[PDB]
mmCIF file with all atom_site columns, C-alpha atoms in Angstrom:
data_model
loop_
_atom_site.group_PDB
_atom_site.id
_atom_site.type_symbol
_atom_site.label_atom_id
_atom_site.label_alt_id
_atom_site.label_comp_id
_atom_site.label_asym_id
_atom_site.label_entity_id
_atom_site.label_seq_id
_atom_site.pdbx_PDB_ins_code
_atom_site.Cartn_x
_atom_site.Cartn_y
_atom_site.Cartn_z
_atom_site.occupancy
_atom_site.B_iso_or_equiv
_atom_site.pdbx_formal_charge
_atom_site.auth_seq_id
_atom_site.auth_comp_id
_atom_site.auth_asym_id
_atom_site.auth_atom_id
_atom_site.pdbx_PDB_model_num
ATOM 1   C CA . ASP A 1 1  ? -212.755 217.665 41.062  1.00 0.00 ? 199  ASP A CA 1
ATOM 2   C CA . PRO A 1 2  ? -216.261 218.433 42.405  1.00 0.00 ? 200  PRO A CA 1
ATOM 3   C CA . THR A 1 3  ? -217.607 218.989 38.884  1.00 0.00 ? 201  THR A CA 1
ATOM 4   C CA . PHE A 1 4  ? -218.277 215.264 38.573  1.00 0.00 ? 202  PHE A CA 1
ATOM 5   C CA . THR A 1 5  ? -219.328 214.732 42.184  1.00 0.00 ? 203  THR A CA 1
ATOM 6   C CA . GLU A 1 6  ? -221.492 216.478 44.855  1.00 0.00 ? 204  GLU A CA 1
ATOM 7   C CA . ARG A 1 7  ? -224.532 216.104 42.591  1.00 0.00 ? 205  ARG A CA 1
ATOM 8   C CA . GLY A 1 8  ? -225.969 213.047 44.330  1.00 0.00 ? 206  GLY A CA 1
ATOM 9   C CA . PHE A 1 9  ? -224.058 209.786 44.730  1.00 0.00 ? 207  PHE A CA 1
ATOM 10  C CA . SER A 1 10 ? -226.146 207.622 42.395  1.00 0.00 ? 208  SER A CA 1
ATOM 11  C CA . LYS A 1 11 ? -225.346 204.546 40.326  1.00 0.00 ? 209  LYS A CA 1
ATOM 12  C CA . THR A 1 12 ? -224.836 206.853 37.365  1.00 0.00 ? 210  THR A CA 1
ATOM 13  C CA . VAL A 1 13 ? -222.161 209.278 38.570  1.00 0.00 ? 211  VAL A CA 1
ATOM 14  C CA . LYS A 1 14 ? -219.949 206.407 39.730  1.00 0.00 ? 212  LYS A CA 1
ATOM 15  C CA . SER A 1 15 ? -220.714 204.384 36.589  1.00 0.00 ? 213  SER A CA 1
ATOM 16  C CA . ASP A 1 16 ? -219.365 207.346 34.628  1.00 0.00 ? 214  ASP A CA 1
ATOM 17  C CA . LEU A 1 17 ? -216.424 207.887 37.000  1.00 0.00 ? 215  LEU A CA 1
ATOM 18  C CA . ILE A 1 18 ? -215.300 204.308 36.327  1.00 0.00 ? 216  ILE A CA 1
ATOM 19  C CA . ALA A 1 19 ? -214.895 205.157 32.647  1.00 0.00 ? 217  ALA A CA 1
ATOM 20  C CA . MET A 1 20 ? -213.118 208.329 33.769  1.00 0.00 ? 218  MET A CA 1
ATOM 21  C CA . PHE A 1 21 ? -210.626 206.115 35.634  1.00 0.00 ? 219  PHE A CA 1
ATOM 22  C CA . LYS A 1 22 ? -210.224 203.939 32.554  1.00 0.00 ? 220  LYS A CA 1
ATOM 23  C CA . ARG A 1 23 ? -209.537 207.011 30.433  1.00 0.00 ? 221  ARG A CA 1
ATOM 24  C CA . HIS A 1 24 ? -207.081 208.623 32.845  1.00 0.00 ? 222  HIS A CA 1
ATOM 25  C CA . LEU A 1 25 ? -205.042 205.465 33.364  1.00 0.00 ? 223  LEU A CA 1
ATOM 26  C CA . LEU A 1 26 ? -203.650 205.867 29.853  1.00 0.00 ? 224  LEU A CA 1
ATOM 27  C CA . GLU A 1 27 ? -202.931 209.553 29.268  1.00 0.00 ? 225  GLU A CA 1
ATOM 28  C CA . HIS A 1 28 ? -201.796 210.779 32.663  1.00 0.00 ? 226  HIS A CA 1
ATOM 29  C CA . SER A 1 29 ? -199.750 208.057 34.350  1.00 0.00 ? 227  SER A CA 1
ATOM 30  C CA . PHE A 1 30 ? -196.010 207.631 33.868  1.00 0.00 ? 228  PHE A CA 1
ATOM 31  C CA . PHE A 1 31 ? -195.823 211.219 32.675  1.00 0.00 ? 229  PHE A CA 1
ATOM 32  C CA . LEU A 1 32 ? -192.027 211.235 32.583  1.00 0.00 ? 230  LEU A CA 1
ATOM 33  C CA . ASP A 1 33 ? -192.054 208.730 29.742  1.00 0.00 ? 231  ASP A CA 1
ATOM 34  C CA . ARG A 1 34 ? -194.277 211.161 27.871  1.00 0.00 ? 232  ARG A CA 1
ATOM 35  C CA . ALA A 1 35 ? -192.127 214.200 28.686  1.00 0.00 ? 233  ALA A CA 1
ATOM 36  C CA . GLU A 1 36 ? -188.893 212.518 27.648  1.00 0.00 ? 234  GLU A CA 1
ATOM 37  C CA . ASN A 1 37 ? -190.595 211.870 24.302  1.00 0.00 ? 235  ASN A CA 1
ATOM 38  C CA . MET A 1 38 ? -192.787 214.990 24.073  1.00 0.00 ? 236  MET A CA 1
ATOM 39  C CA . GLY A 1 39 ? -191.962 218.165 22.170  1.00 0.00 ? 237  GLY A CA 1
ATOM 40  C CA . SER A 1 40 ? -190.559 221.461 23.451  1.00 0.00 ? 238  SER A CA 1
ATOM 41  C CA . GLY A 1 41 ? -193.240 221.753 26.145  1.00 0.00 ? 239  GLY A CA 1
ATOM 42  C CA . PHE A 1 42 ? -191.126 219.900 28.675  1.00 0.00 ? 240  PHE A CA 1
ATOM 43  C CA . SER A 1 43 ? -191.268 222.057 31.799  1.00 0.00 ? 241  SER A CA 1
ATOM 44  C CA . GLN A 1 44 ? -194.828 223.373 31.524  1.00 0.00 ? 242  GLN A CA 1
ATOM 45  C CA . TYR A 1 45 ? -196.150 219.822 31.192  1.00 0.00 ? 243  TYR A CA 1
ATOM 46  C CA . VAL A 1 46 ? -194.548 218.684 34.450  1.00 0.00 ? 244  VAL A CA 1
ATOM 47  C CA . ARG A 1 47 ? -195.690 221.910 36.100  1.00 0.00 ? 245  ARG A CA 1
ATOM 48  C CA . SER A 1 48 ? -199.234 221.251 34.879  1.00 0.00 ? 246  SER A CA 1
ATOM 49  C CA . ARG A 1 49 ? -199.223 217.747 36.335  1.00 0.00 ? 247  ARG A CA 1
ATOM 50  C CA . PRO B 2 1  ? -224.979 213.785 12.478  1.00 0.00 ? 1333 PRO B CA 1
ATOM 51  C CA . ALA B 2 2  ? -223.316 211.327 14.813  1.00 0.00 ? 1334 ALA B CA 1
ATOM 52  C CA . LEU B 2 3  ? -220.487 209.041 13.770  1.00 0.00 ? 1335 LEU B CA 1
ATOM 53  C CA . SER B 2 4  ? -222.027 205.975 12.202  1.00 0.00 ? 1336 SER B CA 1
ATOM 54  C CA . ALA B 2 5  ? -220.866 203.460 9.658   1.00 0.00 ? 1337 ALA B CA 1
ATOM 55  C CA . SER B 2 6  ? -221.950 200.229 8.013   1.00 0.00 ? 1338 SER B CA 1
ATOM 56  C CA . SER B 2 7  ? -219.416 197.590 9.003   1.00 0.00 ? 1339 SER B CA 1
ATOM 57  C CA . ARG B 2 8  ? -216.204 197.719 10.950  1.00 0.00 ? 1340 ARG B CA 1
ATOM 58  C CA . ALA B 2 9  ? -214.288 197.977 7.656   1.00 0.00 ? 1341 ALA B CA 1
ATOM 59  C CA . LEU B 2 10 ? -215.046 201.603 6.954   1.00 0.00 ? 1342 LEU B CA 1
ATOM 60  C CA . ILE B 2 11 ? -214.568 202.409 10.646  1.00 0.00 ? 1343 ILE B CA 1
ATOM 61  C CA . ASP B 2 12 ? -211.044 201.080 10.580  1.00 0.00 ? 1344 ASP B CA 1
ATOM 62  C CA . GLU B 2 13 ? -210.479 202.834 7.294   1.00 0.00 ? 1345 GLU B CA 1
ATOM 63  C CA . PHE B 2 14 ? -211.617 206.162 8.746   1.00 0.00 ? 1346 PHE B CA 1
ATOM 64  C CA . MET B 2 15 ? -209.462 205.531 11.795  1.00 0.00 ? 1347 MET B CA 1
ATOM 65  C CA . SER B 2 16 ? -206.477 204.848 9.542   1.00 0.00 ? 1348 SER B CA 1
ATOM 66  C CA . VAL B 2 17 ? -206.431 208.158 7.675   1.00 0.00 ? 1349 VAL B CA 1
ATOM 67  C CA . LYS B 2 18 ? -208.957 210.826 8.577   1.00 0.00 ? 1350 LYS B CA 1
ATOM 68  C CA . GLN B 2 19 ? -208.155 212.936 5.514   1.00 0.00 ? 1351 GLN B CA 1
ATOM 69  C CA . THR B 2 20 ? -208.156 210.714 2.428   1.00 0.00 ? 1352 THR B CA 1
ATOM 70  C CA . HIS B 2 21 ? -210.594 208.017 3.535   1.00 0.00 ? 1353 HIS B CA 1
ATOM 71  C CA . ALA B 2 22 ? -213.852 206.943 1.928   1.00 0.00 ? 1354 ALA B CA 1
ATOM 72  C CA . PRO B 2 23 ? -217.142 208.479 3.008   1.00 0.00 ? 1355 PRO B CA 1
ATOM 73  C CA . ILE B 2 24 ? -218.938 206.265 0.504   1.00 0.00 ? 1356 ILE B CA 1
ATOM 74  C CA . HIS B 2 25 ? -217.903 202.734 -0.400  1.00 0.00 ? 1357 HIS B CA 1
ATOM 75  C CA . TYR B 2 26 ? -219.678 200.557 -2.999  1.00 0.00 ? 1358 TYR B CA 1
ATOM 76  C CA . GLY B 2 27 ? -222.845 199.971 -1.054  1.00 0.00 ? 1359 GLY B CA 1
ATOM 77  C CA . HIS B 2 28 ? -221.272 200.809 2.235   1.00 0.00 ? 1360 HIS B CA 1
ATOM 78  C CA . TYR B 2 29 ? -220.883 204.253 3.715   1.00 0.00 ? 1361 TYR B CA 1
ATOM 79  C CA . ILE B 2 30 ? -219.685 206.073 6.811   1.00 0.00 ? 1362 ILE B CA 1
ATOM 80  C CA . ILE B 2 31 ? -220.816 209.469 8.077   1.00 0.00 ? 1363 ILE B CA 1
ATOM 81  C CA . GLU B 2 32 ? -218.138 211.553 9.714   1.00 0.00 ? 1364 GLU B CA 1
ATOM 82  C CA . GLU B 2 33 ? -218.442 213.042 13.166  1.00 0.00 ? 1365 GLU B CA 1
ATOM 83  C CA . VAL B 2 34 ? -219.288 216.758 13.103  1.00 0.00 ? 1366 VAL B CA 1
ATOM 84  C CA . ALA B 2 35 ? -220.504 218.117 16.404  1.00 0.00 ? 1367 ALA B CA 1
ATOM 85  C CA . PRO B 2 36 ? -220.267 221.024 18.817  1.00 0.00 ? 1368 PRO B CA 1
ATOM 86  C CA . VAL B 2 37 ? -217.968 218.794 20.862  1.00 0.00 ? 1369 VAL B CA 1
ATOM 87  C CA . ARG B 2 38 ? -215.355 217.451 18.470  1.00 0.00 ? 1370 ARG B CA 1
ATOM 88  C CA . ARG B 2 39 ? -214.603 214.223 20.265  1.00 0.00 ? 1371 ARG B CA 1
ATOM 89  C CA . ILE B 2 40 ? -211.305 212.381 20.585  1.00 0.00 ? 1372 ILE B CA 1
ATOM 90  C CA . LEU B 2 41 ? -211.596 208.878 19.129  1.00 0.00 ? 1373 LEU B CA 1
ATOM 91  C CA . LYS B 2 42 ? -209.108 206.280 20.321  1.00 0.00 ? 1374 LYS B CA 1
ATOM 92  C CA . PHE B 2 43 ? -208.661 202.977 18.517  1.00 0.00 ? 1375 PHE B CA 1
ATOM 93  C CA . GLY B 2 44 ? -205.474 201.468 19.829  1.00 0.00 ? 1376 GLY B CA 1
ATOM 94  C CA . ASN B 2 45 ? -202.719 203.964 19.242  1.00 0.00 ? 1377 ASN B CA 1
ATOM 95  C CA . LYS B 2 46 ? -204.420 205.314 16.129  1.00 0.00 ? 1378 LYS B CA 1
ATOM 96  C CA . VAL B 2 47 ? -206.251 208.374 17.402  1.00 0.00 ? 1379 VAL B CA 1
ATOM 97  C CA . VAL B 2 48 ? -207.696 211.200 15.322  1.00 0.00 ? 1380 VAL B CA 1
ATOM 98  C CA . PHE B 2 49 ? -209.141 214.669 15.828  1.00 0.00 ? 1381 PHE B CA 1
ATOM 99  C CA . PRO C 3 1  ? -224.069 227.230 38.404  1.00 0.00 ? 396  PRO C CA 1
ATOM 100 C CA . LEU C 3 2  ? -221.609 227.884 35.567  1.00 0.00 ? 397  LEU C CA 1
ATOM 101 C CA . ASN C 3 3  ? -221.341 224.097 35.181  1.00 0.00 ? 398  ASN C CA 1
ATOM 102 C CA . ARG C 3 4  ? -224.370 224.016 32.917  1.00 0.00 ? 399  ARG C CA 1
ATOM 103 C CA . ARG C 3 5  ? -225.497 221.041 30.872  1.00 0.00 ? 400  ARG C CA 1
ATOM 104 C CA . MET C 3 6  ? -226.234 221.470 27.206  1.00 0.00 ? 401  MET C CA 1
ATOM 105 C CA . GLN C 3 7  ? -228.407 218.790 25.615  1.00 0.00 ? 402  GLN C CA 1
ATOM 106 C CA . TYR C 3 8  ? -227.458 218.256 21.983  1.00 0.00 ? 403  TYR C CA 1
ATOM 107 C CA . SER C 3 9  ? -229.504 215.909 19.844  1.00 0.00 ? 404  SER C CA 1
ATOM 108 C CA . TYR C 3 10 ? -227.358 213.640 17.685  1.00 0.00 ? 405  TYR C CA 1
ATOM 109 C CA . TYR C 3 11 ? -228.797 211.426 15.001  1.00 0.00 ? 406  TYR C CA 1
ATOM 110 C CA . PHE C 3 12 ? -227.567 208.791 12.581  1.00 0.00 ? 407  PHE C CA 1
ATOM 111 C CA . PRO C 3 13 ? -229.269 206.601 9.981   1.00 0.00 ? 408  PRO C CA 1
ATOM 112 C CA . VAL C 3 14 ? -229.141 202.844 9.635   1.00 0.00 ? 409  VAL C CA 1
ATOM 113 C CA . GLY C 3 15 ? -229.848 200.583 6.707   1.00 0.00 ? 410  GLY C CA 1
ATOM 114 C CA . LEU C 3 16 ? -229.777 203.057 3.854   1.00 0.00 ? 411  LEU C CA 1
ATOM 115 C CA . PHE C 3 17 ? -229.131 202.208 0.229   1.00 0.00 ? 412  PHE C CA 1
ATOM 116 C CA . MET C 3 18 ? -227.112 203.804 -2.524  1.00 0.00 ? 413  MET C CA 1
ATOM 117 C CA . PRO C 3 19 ? -228.524 204.482 -5.973  1.00 0.00 ? 414  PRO C CA 1
ATOM 118 C CA . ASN C 3 20 ? -227.582 201.903 -8.602  1.00 0.00 ? 415  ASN C CA 1
ATOM 119 C CA . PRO C 3 21 ? -224.458 203.582 -10.053 1.00 0.00 ? 416  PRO C CA 1
ATOM 120 C CA . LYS C 3 22 ? -222.267 202.523 -7.158  1.00 0.00 ? 417  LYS C CA 1
ATOM 121 C CA . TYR C 3 23 ? -218.745 203.881 -6.835  1.00 0.00 ? 418  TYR C CA 1
ATOM 122 C CA . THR C 3 24 ? -215.816 203.877 -4.456  1.00 0.00 ? 419  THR C CA 1
ATOM 123 C CA . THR C 3 25 ? -213.308 206.457 -3.334  1.00 0.00 ? 420  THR C CA 1
ATOM 124 C CA . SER C 3 26 ? -210.674 204.343 -1.581  1.00 0.00 ? 421  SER C CA 1
ATOM 125 C CA . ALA C 3 27 ? -208.358 201.970 -3.416  1.00 0.00 ? 422  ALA C CA 1
ATOM 126 C CA . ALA C 3 28 ? -207.655 199.925 -0.287  1.00 0.00 ? 423  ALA C CA 1
ATOM 127 C CA . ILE C 3 29 ? -210.828 198.224 0.923   1.00 0.00 ? 424  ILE C CA 1
ATOM 128 C CA . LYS C 3 30 ? -212.166 195.458 -1.286  1.00 0.00 ? 425  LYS C CA 1
ATOM 129 C CA . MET C 3 31 ? -214.866 193.390 0.367   1.00 0.00 ? 426  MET C CA 1
ATOM 130 C CA . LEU C 3 32 ? -214.804 189.655 -0.288  1.00 0.00 ? 427  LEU C CA 1
ATOM 131 C CA . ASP C 3 33 ? -218.271 189.282 -1.773  1.00 0.00 ? 428  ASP C CA 1
ATOM 132 C CA . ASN C 3 34 ? -220.171 190.510 -4.787  1.00 0.00 ? 429  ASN C CA 1
ATOM 133 C CA . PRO C 3 35 ? -220.139 194.232 -3.994  1.00 0.00 ? 430  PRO C CA 1
ATOM 134 C CA . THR C 3 36 ? -222.945 195.321 -6.295  1.00 0.00 ? 431  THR C CA 1
ATOM 135 C CA . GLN C 3 37 ? -225.790 193.522 -4.476  1.00 0.00 ? 432  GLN C CA 1
ATOM 136 C CA . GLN C 3 38 ? -224.656 194.816 -1.098  1.00 0.00 ? 433  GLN C CA 1
ATOM 137 C CA . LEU C 3 39 ? -226.587 196.841 1.471   1.00 0.00 ? 434  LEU C CA 1
ATOM 138 C CA . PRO C 3 40 ? -225.881 197.458 5.153   1.00 0.00 ? 435  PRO C CA 1
ATOM 139 C CA . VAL C 3 41 ? -227.841 195.642 7.800   1.00 0.00 ? 436  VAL C CA 1
ATOM 140 C CA . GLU C 3 42 ? -226.505 197.582 10.720  1.00 0.00 ? 437  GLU C CA 1
ATOM 141 C CA . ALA C 3 43 ? -224.689 200.593 12.125  1.00 0.00 ? 438  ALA C CA 1
ATOM 142 C CA . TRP C 3 44 ? -221.633 200.765 14.348  1.00 0.00 ? 439  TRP C CA 1
ATOM 143 C CA . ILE C 3 45 ? -221.481 203.977 16.325  1.00 0.00 ? 440  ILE C CA 1
ATOM 144 C CA . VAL C 3 46 ? -218.961 204.971 18.970  1.00 0.00 ? 441  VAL C CA 1
ATOM 145 C CA . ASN C 3 47 ? -219.672 205.584 22.621  1.00 0.00 ? 442  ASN C CA 1
ATOM 146 C CA . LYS C 3 48 ? -218.087 207.881 25.179  1.00 0.00 ? 443  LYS C CA 1
ATOM 147 C CA . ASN C 3 49 ? -215.587 205.107 25.963  1.00 0.00 ? 444  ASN C CA 1
ATOM 148 C CA . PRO D 3 1  ? -190.439 201.919 49.622  1.00 0.00 ? 396  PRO D CA 1
ATOM 149 C CA . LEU D 3 2  ? -191.063 204.220 46.677  1.00 0.00 ? 397  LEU D CA 1
ATOM 150 C CA . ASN D 3 3  ? -190.049 201.217 44.546  1.00 0.00 ? 398  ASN D CA 1
ATOM 151 C CA . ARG D 3 4  ? -193.582 199.922 44.392  1.00 0.00 ? 399  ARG D CA 1
ATOM 152 C CA . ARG D 3 5  ? -194.759 197.027 42.261  1.00 0.00 ? 400  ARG D CA 1
ATOM 153 C CA . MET D 3 6  ? -197.723 197.690 39.991  1.00 0.00 ? 401  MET D CA 1
ATOM 154 C CA . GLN D 3 7  ? -199.024 194.446 38.496  1.00 0.00 ? 402  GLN D CA 1
ATOM 155 C CA . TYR D 3 8  ? -200.807 195.422 35.277  1.00 0.00 ? 403  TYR D CA 1
ATOM 156 C CA . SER D 3 9  ? -202.585 192.367 33.973  1.00 0.00 ? 404  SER D CA 1
ATOM 157 C CA . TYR D 3 10 ? -202.445 191.963 30.209  1.00 0.00 ? 405  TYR D CA 1
ATOM 158 C CA . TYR D 3 11 ? -204.620 189.731 28.066  1.00 0.00 ? 406  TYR D CA 1
ATOM 159 C CA . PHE D 3 12 ? -204.726 188.629 24.467  1.00 0.00 ? 407  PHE D CA 1
ATOM 160 C CA . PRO D 3 13 ? -206.849 186.166 22.497  1.00 0.00 ? 408  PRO D CA 1
ATOM 161 C CA . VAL D 3 14 ? -205.876 183.230 20.360  1.00 0.00 ? 409  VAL D CA 1
ATOM 162 C CA . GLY D 3 15 ? -207.989 181.288 17.915  1.00 0.00 ? 410  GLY D CA 1
ATOM 163 C CA . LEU D 3 16 ? -210.538 183.964 17.115  1.00 0.00 ? 411  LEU D CA 1
ATOM 164 C CA . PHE D 3 17 ? -212.305 184.131 13.777  1.00 0.00 ? 412  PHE D CA 1
ATOM 165 C CA . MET D 3 18 ? -213.701 186.894 11.606  1.00 0.00 ? 413  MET D CA 1
ATOM 166 C CA . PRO D 3 19 ? -217.319 186.846 10.458  1.00 0.00 ? 414  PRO D CA 1
ATOM 167 C CA . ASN D 3 20 ? -218.067 185.809 6.895   1.00 0.00 ? 415  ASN D CA 1
ATOM 168 C CA . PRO D 3 21 ? -218.074 189.266 5.211   1.00 0.00 ? 416  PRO D CA 1
ATOM 169 C CA . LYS D 3 22 ? -214.307 189.450 4.877   1.00 0.00 ? 417  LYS D CA 1
ATOM 170 C CA . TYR D 3 23 ? -212.261 192.344 3.630   1.00 0.00 ? 418  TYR D CA 1
ATOM 171 C CA . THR D 3 24 ? -208.949 194.142 3.868   1.00 0.00 ? 419  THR D CA 1
ATOM 172 C CA . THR D 3 25 ? -207.511 197.417 5.100   1.00 0.00 ? 420  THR D CA 1
ATOM 173 C CA . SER D 3 26 ? -204.044 197.782 3.557   1.00 0.00 ? 421  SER D CA 1
ATOM 174 C CA . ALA D 3 27 ? -203.628 196.550 -0.001  1.00 0.00 ? 422  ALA D CA 1
ATOM 175 C CA . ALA D 3 28 ? -199.828 196.402 -0.010  1.00 0.00 ? 423  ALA D CA 1
ATOM 176 C CA . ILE D 3 29 ? -199.667 192.988 1.697   1.00 0.00 ? 424  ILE D CA 1
ATOM 177 C CA . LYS D 3 30 ? -200.446 189.705 -0.039  1.00 0.00 ? 425  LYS D CA 1
ATOM 178 C CA . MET D 3 31 ? -200.575 186.095 1.090   1.00 0.00 ? 426  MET D CA 1
ATOM 179 C CA . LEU D 3 32 ? -200.098 182.965 -0.997  1.00 0.00 ? 427  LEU D CA 1
ATOM 180 C CA . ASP D 3 33 ? -203.274 181.287 0.169   1.00 0.00 ? 428  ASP D CA 1
ATOM 181 C CA . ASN D 3 34 ? -206.938 181.227 -0.722  1.00 0.00 ? 429  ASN D CA 1
ATOM 182 C CA . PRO D 3 35 ? -207.941 184.231 1.380   1.00 0.00 ? 430  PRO D CA 1
ATOM 183 C CA . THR D 3 36 ? -211.567 183.360 2.130   1.00 0.00 ? 431  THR D CA 1
ATOM 184 C CA . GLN D 3 37 ? -211.081 180.291 4.329   1.00 0.00 ? 432  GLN D CA 1
ATOM 185 C CA . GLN D 3 38 ? -208.183 180.765 6.728   1.00 0.00 ? 433  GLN D CA 1
ATOM 186 C CA . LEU D 3 39 ? -207.889 180.629 10.469  1.00 0.00 ? 434  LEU D CA 1
ATOM 187 C CA . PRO D 3 40 ? -205.711 182.355 13.057  1.00 0.00 ? 435  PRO D CA 1
ATOM 188 C CA . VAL D 3 41 ? -204.328 179.303 14.801  1.00 0.00 ? 436  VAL D CA 1
ATOM 189 C CA . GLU D 3 42 ? -201.220 180.682 16.556  1.00 0.00 ? 437  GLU D CA 1
ATOM 190 C CA . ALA D 3 43 ? -200.537 184.039 18.178  1.00 0.00 ? 438  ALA D CA 1
ATOM 191 C CA . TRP D 3 44 ? -197.266 185.937 18.126  1.00 0.00 ? 439  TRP D CA 1
ATOM 192 C CA . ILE D 3 45 ? -196.733 188.394 20.971  1.00 0.00 ? 440  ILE D CA 1
ATOM 193 C CA . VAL D 3 46 ? -193.735 190.557 21.828  1.00 0.00 ? 441  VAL D CA 1
ATOM 194 C CA . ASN D 3 47 ? -191.648 189.850 24.909  1.00 0.00 ? 442  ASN D CA 1
ATOM 195 C CA . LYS D 3 48 ? -189.856 192.308 27.166  1.00 0.00 ? 443  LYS D CA 1
ATOM 196 C CA . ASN D 3 49 ? -186.606 191.828 25.252  1.00 0.00 ? 444  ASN D CA 1
#
């Protein structure tokens, strides 16, 4: 997603992208375990991912 | 007003129930987070909106 | 250029003090000291992580 | 070879100690001990089974 990047590869953009990695390791990996326990939005969730 | 508190006690009260918690303890106090960006706050699996 | 950056100014106090009729609004937290002569020394705010 | 092996390292402390302003969060649990001076000496964790 070039929103974060292509602004100038400083210490700061990568030092924020590390916390982005830490936040996305929890809510968007092993999505099938979410979708087998999620509500009625089964198919649209997998299509989104 | 940003989300501040006094000790960790009122923080982990406000993370427990975001509806019926204390804004003002005996001498202690905690100011709730109202903002243009209403942030997600994760504390373990307890997570509020 | 539609990826603008707003710059909000948050604020929070630290080290305030209640007036002498001190009350509480949660029947769970009881601190293990004399609660009347209590005043915060600090503030615990939350970050983007 | 889609059966890859992620090795997520976990970590947990033992023997840690609260600071001297002590308190509670849920008031429906009691212990038959003087609550001020007590120490977490062991740690219980939960296995895969």
